[PDB]
Amino acid sequence: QYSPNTQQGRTSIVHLFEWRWVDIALECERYLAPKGFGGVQVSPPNENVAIYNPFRPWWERYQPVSYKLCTRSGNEDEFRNMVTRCNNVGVRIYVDAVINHMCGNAVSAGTSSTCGSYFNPGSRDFPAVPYSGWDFNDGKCKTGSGDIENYNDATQVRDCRLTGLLDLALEKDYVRSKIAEYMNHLIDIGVAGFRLDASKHMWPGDIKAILDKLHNLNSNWFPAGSKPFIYQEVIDLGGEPIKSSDYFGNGRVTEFKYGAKLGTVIRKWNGEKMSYLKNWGEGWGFVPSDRALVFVDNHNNQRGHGAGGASILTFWDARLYKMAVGFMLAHPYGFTRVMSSYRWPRQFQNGNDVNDWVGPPNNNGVIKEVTINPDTTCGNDWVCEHRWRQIRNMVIFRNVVDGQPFTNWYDNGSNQVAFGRGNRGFIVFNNDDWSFSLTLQTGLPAGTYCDVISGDKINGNCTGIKIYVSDDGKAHFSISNSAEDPFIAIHAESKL
Numbered sequence: 001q002y003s004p005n006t007q008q009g010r011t012s013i014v015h016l017f018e019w020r021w022v023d024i025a026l027e028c029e030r031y032l033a034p035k036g037f038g039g040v041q042v043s044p045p046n047e048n049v050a051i052y053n054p055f056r057p058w059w060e061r062y063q064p065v066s067y068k069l070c071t072r073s074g075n076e077d078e079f080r081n082m083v084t085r086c087n088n089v090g091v092r093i094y095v096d097a098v099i100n101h102m103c104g105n106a107v108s109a110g111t112s113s114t115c116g117s118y119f120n121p122g123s124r125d126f127p128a129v130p131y132s133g134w135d136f137n138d139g140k141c142k143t144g145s146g147d148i149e150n151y152n153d154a155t156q157v158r159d160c161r162l163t164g165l166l167d168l169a170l171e172k173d174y175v176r177s178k179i180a181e182y183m184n185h186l187i188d189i190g191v192a193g194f195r196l197d198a199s200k201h202m203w204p205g206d207i208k209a210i211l212d213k214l215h216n217l218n219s220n221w222f223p224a225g226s227k228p229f230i231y232q233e234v235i236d237l238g239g240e241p242i243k244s245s246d247y248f249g250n251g252r253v254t255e256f257k258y259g260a261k262l263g264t265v266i267r268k269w270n271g272e273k274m275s276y277l278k279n280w281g282e283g284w285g286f287v288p289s290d291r292a293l294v295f296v297d298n299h300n301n302q303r304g305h306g307a308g309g310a311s312i313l314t315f316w317d318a319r320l321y322k323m324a325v326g327f328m329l330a331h332p333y334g335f336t337r338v339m340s341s342y343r344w345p346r347q348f349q350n351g352n353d354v355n356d357w358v359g360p361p362n363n364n365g366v367i368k369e370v371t372i373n374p375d376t377t378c379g380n381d382w383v384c385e386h387r388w389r390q391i392r393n394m395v396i397f398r399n400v401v402d403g404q405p406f407t408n409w410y411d412n413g414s415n416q417v418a419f420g421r422g423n424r425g426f427i428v429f430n431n432d433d434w435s436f437s438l439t440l441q442t443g444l445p446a447g448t449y450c451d452v453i454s455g456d457k458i459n460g461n462c463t464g465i466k467i468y469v470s471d472d473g474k475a476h477f478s479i480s481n482s483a484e485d486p487f488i489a490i491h492a493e494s495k496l
């Protein structure tokens with residue numbers, strides 16, 4: 001469960017948040033495969049509640065109605081078409097599996113669902129699965145409200161209703177089997193693994209019982225005996241009784257300390273300084289690197305949901321954001337997920353975004369096409385961070401330096417730092433309020449190297465900054481503190 005099952009040499013996945021299956025299928029062939037991406041986390045592919053108050057929020061997809069593959073992203077044929085075409089060019093699909101719960105206990109009964117399935121939350125009836133009253137934890141939960149009241153109590157976090165969401169009785173073999181039937185349906189279509197949503201609200205043993213029932217990956221694309229990649233969403237910032245290490249037996253865990261600490265460092269809040277990143281990783285209290293799924297922001301905390309707080313960097317803070325993502329993608333700790341978002345009319349009232357609910361770009365609920373502009377950016381309000389040159393070239397950086405040790409670290413005692421990855425890549429940052437001009441040891445073979453942050457290598461030429469490494473591995477680096485991108489990166493495959 002710990003290995004992502006990407007094609008060898010492909011080291012990241014991208015969360016194509018709320019994209020449609022047809023758009024993802026095309027993106028695999030025209031972009032993700034040629035640019036060396038490892039895979040795509042898709043939004044939950046199972047039927048959810050169509051919520052109209054407010055109007056079709058992104059988070060209606062975390063309120064399941066059934067396990068039919070029938071959503072605003074597409075129907076089952078399009079989902080299958082996507083996974084096949086993506087696997088056919090060597091780009092994996094990972095499913096956001098919402099398996100802790102069904103919809104909100106207060107949603108109205110009816111057919112307001114993305115496949116029109118009937119469901120009745122008051123009476124606990126989900127006949128399209130089918131689930132009924134004795135498939136939820138109403139009788140297990142001990143809180144007064146029936147919802148989770150106190151996170152210092154590990155048992156109610158598991159058996160009670162996360163913000164009112166009907167809590168599946170994951171102890172029963174029937175519920176475990178119905179979930180496993182859904183997941184095996186996905187696996188045989190060809191998915192490489194799963195994000196387990198709200199894993200902190202499931203017992204590690206119940207998760208295990210579910211995964212024990214799963215097939216091996218589809219043997220047309222994966223070697224025989226491959227198991228699905230598992231990363232569990234556990235928000236563990238410390239000080240709670242539940243520890244993400246309690247989930248290491250099922251697979252990797254999301255490491256939410258990563259983005260919170262890195263964002264604090266890059267914003268230079270709280271006295272933090274990039275020079276402190278010299279022991280980045282477990283030295284900062286993070287989970288072991290082989291159990292970490294890392295990311296700068298995710299779909300929740302880029303909009304104030306979940307956790308991570310004010311320090312989280314997002315596409316809204318683009319200049320610092322590219323630096324954070326670049327550092328993450330260059331540093332060997334963890335398996336990297338890159339966020340890919342859409343813009344929404346973010347409108348802060350008292351420090352709260354009253355439109356943090358707004359769903360994907362849409363006309364009357366029908367999700368807009370991801371259009372591709374002539375400059376390879378996206379139209380229709382898809383941000384497409386994974387197409388930003390500085391991010392995409394760092395995804396390639398991580399591929400190129402895969403397996404090389406962290407080495408040749410430099411810092412100025414403040415916010416000017418550099419480090420290499422064996423003899424295959426080297427990266428230099430200036431986050432101080434003055435300029436950086438220094439000759440550094442790069443660990444690279446002598447030559448002329450395109451900076452892949454400011455430009456590209458294209459047939460014997462660089463379109464941006466050139467870096468000249470001497471026979472002793474030293475090279476001069478010049479970064480003004482007013483630089484648009486105040487960092488430079490070079491690697492073995494940007495060498496002329």
Ligand SMILES: OC[C@H]1O[C@H](O[C@H]2[C@H](O)[C@@H](O)[C@@H](O[C@H]3[C@H](O)[C@@H](O)[C@@H](O[C@H]4[C@H](O)[C@@H](O)[C@@H](O[C@H]5[C@H](O)[C@@H](O)[C@@H](O[C@H]6[C@H](O)[C@@H](O)[C@@H](O)O[C@@H]6CO)O[C@@H]5CO)O[C@@H]4CO)O[C@@H]3CO)O[C@@H]2CO)[C@H](O)[C@@H](O)[C@@H]1O
Binds near residue numbers: 131134174
């Ligand atoms: O056909 C007409 C029919 O309509 C209703 O039944 C339908 C129901 O509304 C609908 O949800 C679905 O039923 C599903 C059910 O939703 C699922 O939960 C699933 O049920 C299985 C269950 O989850 C398993 O735990 C297992 O049940 C065990 C129980 O754990 C035991 O307690 C014991 O049950 C007896 C119980 O002790 C007594 O208190 C008493 O209430 O009677 C119970 C019957 O013995 O033994 C069973 C062992 O079966 O196994 C369940 C079945 O696999 O799967 C159901 C089937 O889809 O579809 C229902 C049928 O349409 C309405 O409730 C019915 O009265 C009516 O006949």
Ligand SMILES: OC[C@H]1O[C@H](O[C@H]2[C@H](O)[C@@H](O)[C@@H](O[C@H]3[C@H](O)[C@@H](O)[C@@H](O[C@H]4[C@H](O)[C@@H](O)[C@@H](O[C@H]5[C@H](O)[C@@H](O)[C@@H](O[C@H]6[C@H](O)[C@@H](O)[C@@H](O)O[C@@H]6CO)O[C@@H]5CO)O[C@@H]4CO)O[C@@H]3CO)O[C@@H]2CO)[C@H](O)[C@@H](O)[C@@H]1O
Binds near residue numbers: 063104165197305306
């Ligand atoms: O039904 C009546 C009901 O109304 C209210 O609740 C509704 C709510 O207002 C509405 O926004 C929506 O809820 C959304 C939710 O806003 C979304 O954020 C989203 O949450 C899902 C999320 O995408 C998942 O990644 C996942 O995040 C969970 C974590 O897994 C949890 O561990 C937990 O994080 C806590 C963390 O564990 C702690 O360390 C600490 O940091 O506190 C954190 C609290 O954030 O919560 C996040 C939530 O983001 O799990 C989510 C489920 O998949 O999707 C939700 C569903 O659409 O729907 C609500 C119910 O309809 C009102 O709150 C209720 O009291 C009332 O009963």
Ligand SMILES: OC[C@H]1O[C@H](O[C@H]2[C@H](O)[C@@H](O)[C@@H](O[C@H]3[C@H](O)[C@@H](O)[C@@H](O[C@H]4[C@H](O)[C@@H](O)[C@@H](O)O[C@@H]4CO)O[C@@H]3CO)O[C@@H]2CO)[C@H](O)[C@@H](O)[C@@H]1O
Binds near residue numbers: 106
């Ligand atoms: O879009 C702008 C703002 O909208 C969001 O909050 C809105 C809701 O989307 C609206 O629907 C409305 O909410 C009302 C609701 O319309 C009203 O029916 C009533 O809800 C009842 C419910 O119908 C009833 O069945 C039962 O469930 O009890 C509910 C009340 O407890 O009351 C709701 C408000 O209390 O108004 C709000 C506020 O504008 C969006 O999330 C906002 O951030 C956004 O600014």
Ligand SMILES: OC[C@H]1O[C@H](O[C@H]2[C@H](O)[C@@H](O)[C@@H](O[C@H]3[C@H](O)[C@@H](O)[C@@H](O[C@H]4[C@H](O)[C@@H](O)[C@@H](O)O[C@@H]4CO)O[C@@H]3CO)O[C@@H]2CO)[C@H](O)[C@@H](O)[C@@H]1O
Binds near residue numbers: 362366
């Ligand atoms: O009542 C629920 C309906 O659910 C399904 O809807 C149908 C529509 O009724 C058809 O009209 C059509 O939808 C069109 C849509 O009308 C058209 O504007 C355009 O929608 C998007 C487009 O997909 C997208 O690429 C974006 O860029 O722009 C447009 C929005 O501005 O194209 C849609 C077709 O792709 O087809 C859907 C379903 O395919 C259901 O099938 C209906 O039975 C039902 O009425």
Ligand SMILES: OC[C@H]1O[C@H](O[C@H]2[C@H](O)[C@@H](O)[C@@H](O)O[C@@H]2CO)[C@H](O)[C@@H](O)[C@@H]1O
Binds near residue numbers: 155170
């Ligand atoms: O392991 C699956 C199982 O976990 C829980 O049982 C726990 C209980 O919560 C602990 O407090 C103690 O009793 O040990 C048990 C095993 O770890 C859930 O209660 C149960 O429903 C679930 O299946």
Ligand SMILES: [Ca+2]
Binds near residue numbers: 100157158159168
């Ligand atoms: Ca639970």
Ligand SMILES: [Cl-]
Binds near residue numbers: 195233298
């Ligand atoms: Cl996540």
